[PDB]
Ligand binder design. Sequence first.
Ligand SMILES: CC(C)(C)OC(=O)c1ccc(-n2ncc(-n3ccnn3)c2O)nc1
Ligand SMILES: [Mn+2]
Length: 197
Amino acid sequence: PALKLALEYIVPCMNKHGICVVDDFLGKETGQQIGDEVRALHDGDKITWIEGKEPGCETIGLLMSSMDDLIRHCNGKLGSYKINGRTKAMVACYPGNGTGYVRHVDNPNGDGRCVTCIYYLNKDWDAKVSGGILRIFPEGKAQFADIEPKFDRLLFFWSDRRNPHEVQPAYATRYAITVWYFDADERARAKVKYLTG
Ligand SMILES: CC(C)(C)OC(=O)c1ccc(-n2ncc(-n3ccnn3)c2O)nc1
Ligand SMILES: [Mn+2]
């Protein structure tokens, strides 16, 4: 149940460490289905933003609705954030040509995004053999964390400067879906600069 998982794990883990992992998020059957839709969608990296209701993206929509379900039950308990929206789903295809991703902060200048959510959908992926490990350096901590892109794994972490992260090279094609949730106040201040946007 999303309620138990949100209050007994996600909320306390995020407030304590700012990095949270949920394994076996949707089950093998749904995971494979999402892989089929992602592969059929993508058949440097390739990026596509999915709203969830497009033809052939129905199970990606279920993934997004499941994430929303968890964040909903975290209402008002993730720090001081008021999460009132999110981006589309960044459905990314990462090439296995021995390329990694430089260390970066997702939201370094307050663009409204407060929580990064990544779902990994590569069945039987063995990071020990194929690479692609995510390395997060939580600010001010004496440790850093290597997160394997395990199949059906869901990852939460703060999007701001608290979590600089880099990705190690991979040697086989892989896919991940990222979604960012907004903070009401921050996202509002970021929208003021635009005429209409
Ligand atoms: C256009 C905007 C500004 C929204 O782009 C981002 O903010 C953004 C995009 C991508 C990533 N990350 N971070 C890790 C990975 N990655 C790579 C392989 N496996 N995971 C990855 O694509 N982070 C932030
Ligand atoms: Mn990132």
